[PDB]
Design a binder for this molecule. Structure first.
Ligand SMILES: C[S@@+](CC[C@H](N)C(=O)[O-])C[C@H]1O[C@@H](n2cnc3c(N)ncnc32)[C@H](O)[C@@H]1O
Ligand SMILES: C[S@@+](CC[C@H](N)C(=O)[O-])C[C@H]1O[C@@H](n2cnc3c(N)ncnc32)[C@H](O)[C@@H]1O
Lengths: 282, 271
């Protein structure tokens, strides 16, 4: 009801006030409130590199340009930290990007994807076909529902990996821990080390107190995020496992040469944090 | 416009202006200095020709990376040259090294350092250091009039020029320059990298850093070596052995190594 072709999309929020990042709108493809959140999709300036942009509640979540960074990091940092990931769960990820990356792994026999907003996937199918192609994969079962409810009703020792593609109390992470198998790996999108370092520390310790043996924060270069860097918490249920070094190097996989960001050297480097934030990983 | 500093094709990044401390064209460029929103973390902001160059918040990232990645790649950096860096941030980091006996800093705009003294006192403090000699002049002209084998490290905080940089460096000399973004101008990085190599430098490696104020949230630096067989991607001398290691807010040896791991789309820059 607002965004007009030729106008400018303006991203801005609290926690980080007195700052704004704006993108020119070439064409508004979708702009309306869904049952759960406000979904905005528009074509960015053709002379710029971003292409099609998706925003949720005013926050950019997907762009054609840097899309691969976040999806490869979440998908591969987690699965390459697992001895043999066969059954995988994705909470959120309706766009299908993380799913696409998880499906590259031949070890994966099945992946369950549970996103609460069915309109996110519908609009992703229409305006991000190269990302959402994964949603129709035989090895994928896509559910439209709450992930909190899903994990609570999932039996013990079901999944090898749980990827939480959504920025969720203690009952939820207790559920994530219990639904994972003994060598299970949990993955969540973490906050920025710049605009909310304090919440990362809290989330990191809270996840460990829930029962997970270890948690490590991985950093990534994603240009569309306010400070140009989001991260991801890679947690481990099993004790005595170092997720900072690739358990199975992706170079041994055939799809290794198809990735645009991730490789074993990026994996290692992602867990190297600036001195001011180093204490998170110790 | 109304209490909002905007930067830059079909995109823009804006900051609210709490108080304008300085805004005028100098002899060489337009210098803007303002206090950002107090409820935000940026603090005092400096922009040159509309481009943010220094903010209180992330200032340390760029200055530590340029200063320490270069010096920690040198066996014994005693004489150092800094072209640009009038704010004094890189100089401050260079001066942390006890091996450094002298540092020459040459910035073309004297008003940049004057305004840095006033509005960035904790950064520009280094400019008055005994081991520092600060010159107001063109670095192109300076390096061409500098004798051969003068410096251990040259930091460019900004063909005849890089020929001069190569010549004025001693045999195990290390050159450092600010590189472009791997996102918004990857093609220029490759050109610059090859061009520096064909000038005569044995090796060149691009280091990546997390700097939140830059358009895409990541600028980089080219660290180049005059001597062949030198791998700058691993610290020659870990900073952990120096007494100032714990004073650094960004740089350490693990970050040093991590900085040269590039995304696959940009890996051809480092081979
Ligand atoms: C669009 S993705 C954001 C990831 C993005 N790539 C980024 O950089 O952060 C977030 C998705 O999580 C979903 N989601 C939000 N709350 C949820 C919940 N409680 N259960 C399951 N999915 C949820 C939303 O529908 C949304 O599509
Ligand atoms: C402020 S620094 C930029 C570094 C900054 N920390 C950043 O984030 O990119 C740029 C300085 O280089 C100086 N400069 C520009 N051209 C120069 C030249 N030809 N010779 C010496 N200094 C020059 C400018 O006067 C300016 O002070």
């Amino acid at each position: 009801s607002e965004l007009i072709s030729g106008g400018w999309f303006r991203e801005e929020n609290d926690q980080w006030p007195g700052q704004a990042m704006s993108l020119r709108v070439e064409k508004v493809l979708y702009d309306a409130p869904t049952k759960f959140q406000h979904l905005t999709i528009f074509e960015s300036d053709p002379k710029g590199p971003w292409g099609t942009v998706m925003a949720l509640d005013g926050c950019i979540q997907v762009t054609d340009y840097d899309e691969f960074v976040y999806h490869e990091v979440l998908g591969h940092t987690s699965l390459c930290s697992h001895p043999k990931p066969e059954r995988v769960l994705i909470i959120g990820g309706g766009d299908g990007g993380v799913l696409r990356e998880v499906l590259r792994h031949g070890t994966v026999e099945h992946c369950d994807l549970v996103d609460i907003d069915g309109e996110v996937m519908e609009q992703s199918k229409q305006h991000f076909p190269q990302i959402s192609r994964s949603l129709a994969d035989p090895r994928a079962t896509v559910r439209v529902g709450d992930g909190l409810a899903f994990v609570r009703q999932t039996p013990d020792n079901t999944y090898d990996v749980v990827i939480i593609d959504t920025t969720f109390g203690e009952a939820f992470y207790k559920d994530v821990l219990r639904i994972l198998k003994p060598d299970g790996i949990c993955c969540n999108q973490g906050e920025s080390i710049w605009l909310d370092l304090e919440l990362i520390e809290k989330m990191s310790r809270f996840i460990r107190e829930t029962g997970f043996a270890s948690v490590q924060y991985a950093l990534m270069h994603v240009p569309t995020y306010p400070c140009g860097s989001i991260g991801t918490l890679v947690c481990s249920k099993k004790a005595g496992v170092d997720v900072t070094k690739p358990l199975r190097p992706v170079e041994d996989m055939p799809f290794a040469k198809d990735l645009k960001y991730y490789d074993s050297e990026m994996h290692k480097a992602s867990f190297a944090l600036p001195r001011f934030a180093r204490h998170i990983n110790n």
